[PDB]
Ligand binder design. Sequence first.
Ligand SMILES: [Mg+2]
Ligand SMILES: [Mg+2]
Ligand SMILES: [Mg+2]
Ligand SMILES: [Mg+2]
Ligand SMILES: [Mn+2]
Ligand SMILES: [Mn+2]
Ligand SMILES: [Mn+2]
Ligand SMILES: [Mn+2]
Lengths: 387, 387, 387, 387
Amino acid sequence: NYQPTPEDRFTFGLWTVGWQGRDPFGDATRRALDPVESVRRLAELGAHGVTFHDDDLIPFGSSDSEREEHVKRFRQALDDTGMKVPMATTNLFTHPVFKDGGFTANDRDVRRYALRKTIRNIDLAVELGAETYVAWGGREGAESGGAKDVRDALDRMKEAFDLLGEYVTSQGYDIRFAIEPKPNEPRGDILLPTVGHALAFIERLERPELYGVNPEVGHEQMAGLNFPHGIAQALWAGKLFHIDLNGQNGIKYDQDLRFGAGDLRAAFWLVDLLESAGYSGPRHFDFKPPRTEDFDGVWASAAGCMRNYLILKERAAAFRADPEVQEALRASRLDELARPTAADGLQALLDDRSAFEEFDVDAAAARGMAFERLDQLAMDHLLGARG
Amino acid sequence: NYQPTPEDRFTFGLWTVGWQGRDPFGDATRRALDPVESVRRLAELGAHGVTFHDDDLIPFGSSDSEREEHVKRFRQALDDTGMKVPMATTNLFTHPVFKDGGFTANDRDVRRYALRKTIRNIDLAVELGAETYVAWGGREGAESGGAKDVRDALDRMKEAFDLLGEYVTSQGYDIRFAIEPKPNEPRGDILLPTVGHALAFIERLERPELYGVNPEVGHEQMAGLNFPHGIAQALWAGKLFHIDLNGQNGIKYDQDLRFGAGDLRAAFWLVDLLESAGYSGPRHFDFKPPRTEDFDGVWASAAGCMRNYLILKERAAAFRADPEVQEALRASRLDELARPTAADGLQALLDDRSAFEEFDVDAAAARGMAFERLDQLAMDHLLGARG
Amino acid sequence: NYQPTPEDRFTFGLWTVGWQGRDPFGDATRRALDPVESVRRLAELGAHGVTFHDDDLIPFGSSDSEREEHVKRFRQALDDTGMKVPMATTNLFTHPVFKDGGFTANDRDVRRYALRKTIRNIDLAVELGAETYVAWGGREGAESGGAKDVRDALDRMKEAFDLLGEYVTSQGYDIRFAIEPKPNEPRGDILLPTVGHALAFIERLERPELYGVNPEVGHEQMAGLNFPHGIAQALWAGKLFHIDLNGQNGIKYDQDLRFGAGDLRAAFWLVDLLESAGYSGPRHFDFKPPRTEDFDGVWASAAGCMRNYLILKERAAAFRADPEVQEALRASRLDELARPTAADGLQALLDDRSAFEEFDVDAAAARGMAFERLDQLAMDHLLGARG
Amino acid sequence: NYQPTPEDRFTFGLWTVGWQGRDPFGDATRRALDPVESVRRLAELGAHGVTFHDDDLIPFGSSDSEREEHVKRFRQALDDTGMKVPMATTNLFTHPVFKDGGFTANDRDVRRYALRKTIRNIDLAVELGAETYVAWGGREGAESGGAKDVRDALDRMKEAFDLLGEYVTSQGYDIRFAIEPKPNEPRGDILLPTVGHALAFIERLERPELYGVNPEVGHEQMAGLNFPHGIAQALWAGKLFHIDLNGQNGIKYDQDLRFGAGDLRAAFWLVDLLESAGYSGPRHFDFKPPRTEDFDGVWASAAGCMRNYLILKERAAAFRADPEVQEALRASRLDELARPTAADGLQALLDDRSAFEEFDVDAAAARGMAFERLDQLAMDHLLGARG
Ligand SMILES: [Mg+2]
Ligand SMILES: [Mg+2]
Ligand SMILES: [Mg+2]
Ligand SMILES: [Mg+2]
Ligand SMILES: [Mn+2]
Ligand SMILES: [Mn+2]
Ligand SMILES: [Mn+2]
Ligand SMILES: [Mn+2]
């Protein structure tokens, strides 16, 4: 009873199911997929849409005439299936010209080329109906301390994004930008390494309302961070424009496992948050079917992403609806956390002797928080052991 | 030739050299230090000032009459030595009443008490001449996913800091706030876990100009992050109000080793940045002399903090002054990174055929970055092997 | 369901439910428990038995007559409840004399005292019926590289365990030793940091048959290692004498969460392994009820340890019993992994042209492993989504 | 100074300086190197010798006659330069047939092929003068818990190494095996993930004397472990047959930076240990010149490997030779750590009242270890600040 449909807003990158399995120590294990084949197979699995890098759809170096042909066959598969393109991005990391970055390469001419490559694909994305344009600065960074003056690099990064915002404003495009953070890999350290750093950077752009974040489960977990907490901060700031769902087993290389794999309880709390907060954007899977798998395994992995989301959504809803959980939340004073600390104001607080001079600190210290009972109720619901 | 003097602006917390050595598995190994003794011994070592938590100087629960006596002896040691108090902070983490937080405790009455405790110590800090008031939210967080609604918690955190800003504004105090991030410990996950998250949070406060960050070497390194990069972002934002220097060996418990220990090359690049950028604030050591040490070892550890900074400052200056390094920086195009990408503007960039239509991507891709020669010159300077 | 009974062999350390909640940054939040109370409360929850450090039972420094009194009360509570004592250990880490270690302290007189303290408690352990004596060398290690010659320290460690083995054999005691590894905390690096290092060390003892490992879920995960894989290697070597179950969220301080929390899927695969291998020793919980909790929360946390084991045991049994899973294990060739590679022998392999000269490597390379289907079946079973 | 010469025993893999720069997210940035060119360039830099995978030298799939041709050219370059081949290994990880492992692939026919591929290259290695044959099981492992029965996989791993040992003994080859551990990447978890796990596994082989370890700096650091401590345990066991030197910044993807980069103080203590223990095997660099570099940068990186070893060797020798350091080692009682704990024997220890009944634990507890003074002396020596 966990069948996905387009209403679930599940999306997949062309580069995900299309990943050929080349890793840093190994050759490809699967043939390349025709973008049109991926569109059709994903439609049959119940996906709502696809996403792409420019270079996933149009082979690097194509003439404008070849470019038009690739875009035409792709659009003809979209129209035939009803599939949507909610997000696009630029590949500024594969070609050797980007070995030191795109927007923050030390060479000025490479930075200008990176901007021209990006702008060209923004035109295409808006044409196909994308609402979000993602930037993953995978090559913006350094292996060594002297190679990059980070204040100058952030000036250049701000310059690039300001120019992109000027471009979409002057064209009158309805599209927003989302920065995808990652702490490391393929560079030793990547600029804007977490959701927090990206959120802070946006506030210094000329038009901050145009920019948000596209956090990825695995990337925050590569810094050991709590992904639901980071998503909560992004929602609190009004900046969760898109999200990348997958799996990661802790601090190591970027695994991009299927969603649900990796940290299972973190996935449960993530789904609880997105659904409770009314997140209405795409549920996008930036994952890689392991290279052990043939093409049947590729489609099983993709179907598993969607299935695990739906199972967790049902368990999260049951948790929140259970009156015993409702009572546990009161016992742990989750409702008091929603109450203003001092809506009576500063003067009243300073005059309030029960807040300090007469506060029974030891009685307050003796109150248990009852967090373990609440968390075991959450366990039981996740495991389907309520009964 | 590495003797510290007050001009080096080295400061120490009372809780650092005063750490008695109680750890999660062990009893104290050293007697408590009288604050007056620490002031005098640190003055003799060449320190510029001390910092304190309220509860380091005034034992928790003291009457206002006892409070005045503790403050009076302390001020009499400050006046006798010329020692400064550039920073103070509140202890909102030791007493059991704070077991679920201060500003974001689920219980509303604890949040009101935490604010009253903080405001009382702001008065004292301004009286003693502190320029910066630090907040380390060590207990703001959770071990389990249901225990804390993080959007509500951030509402409460914003409320607390807004009220503190209203208080200092209405009193006309010349003091600024600095948030000290930490990703975890003693809570399973701490709110505002990195420099980035804290920078982003500040931008949503009512008076953001009043607030900056107090990053700590070890804390960013507990998330595997590059501390010089994070400091560079804070400087770029204009938000580096204070800094905590110490040592950490990677991702594990918060070690608070003496500065220079832990990640030595990261310390070299940190000093290079602070000195090149003209950071003029305190060089504050938030460290703990290991509990293996007696009191001689405590003062050797503190002296070592200051010594390692001065050695690294000399090596960093020699690196930047070396004409061979100056040439290597040009060879790696660090100067081009300082140049605007497109100060000719968007229209000109779009019309510039050399930036895309006629860009020789393969010639540009063949250019080496010469980063390894530069980094070995940096190695040689750090090791004093230039000759 | 999921009610624990004594046959389930669940055990708890006195120091687990007895943890008063003091951590590196905070005071105790709970009063101390009488060991007699812990025995009776744990019996009521359905535990099989209790374990202890010498210092958990007999306050450090007690006279021989005060000692006998505390032992008397404890034994009475055991006799009244039928509760077992399957394991005991020595506290060689809390008292300041052990600040540089016990068995490997640089000071020779401390090492001799450590051995005498341990031997005294071995006698007590055998009296109470313990079959395993655990050693956690929590202070054996260093913060700095010069402080410890690790070759000499391993000589001292081997000497200590060799002397202990000579003592138990000369007494005719039925008791085996188990080393509990941990990578760090409270020392910067701890000797024998993982299951593997401990297994290697045992092979150099004079009587290796007397020694095995006591691995702990959270400790191996503090090095980012796969705990089921490590337990498999210990079982393969015949050295899994005992196990410590708890939860841990990745690489950070030692959290000691209740079992099932932390990494839930790793908990599932661990229980699958222990049950399918027929491990018949204690299921011991080395955990700390979070300091947010009162005593009701302490007992809810302990009961949750046992509940989560029983739920996971049911799910793993259902996984293995599922004919569809048995078919997927065959599709992924798990049964071929148990076939010897070359039971026909070295000469036959060298002459077998189908193993090289005529091996179709491209046809072999194209076979999918079908691991993703198998893993989604395991996911469905864990979540109770089969049926 | 710091000019390397052949007596320094520096060696390099063909695959190190030959790395073309392809990573999981990018194409090659450098052309392929002729192995004959690498031999001659490395000889000019002062290297002692080269190492190789079979597939580095002979393109995979080559006929027997094409094979002999490539070997011929290589041997000519060795004869012309005097360059040694102290070590060789098998590539069991690049070709897609090895996607589930070589020795522990689930498919039995792949395991047999893996053994034949290895045996063919052992013959070549012995011809060229290799004394050590290295095995890095980079594909032995799993991404998911059900995909591999680790007990059966360890049986298959033991079978393979037992067959290899039978082959070399039946041929009368003078060659020993060394296992290279790695915790993860490219598999989610790799079997025998650390030095300790590998040492334990060797003790269960039929001919343990034939097998040792080839530890790599970066791999142990990828588990957050102390690499000098691990090397000390391997030396203590008589199993350090070979070593891989490089640099790594903490827990993340396998960086393979040049030696000295990464964790500089750990590099210092490593060199101190190897030189003071008299390790006389190859100083092998398993590193990757960053893909930002052209071929000038490739040779600068390789030369930097050797330079940094020689600088650190000089500093550690000066540290150990310093009378003031010798006095500090005595103050910290390093000499007492080498004294047997109880050479008077078990009976004497039990009767010695000064070891327990009359031991002044409080006086012992008050002794400082003086570790911070000793470590600052080591810091001064590393930085060249003594004198
Ligand atoms: Mg992504
Ligand atoms: Mg601090
Ligand atoms: Mg334990
Ligand atoms: Mg290697
Ligand atoms: Mn990823
Ligand atoms: Mn700290
Ligand atoms: Mn633990
Ligand atoms: Mn490596």
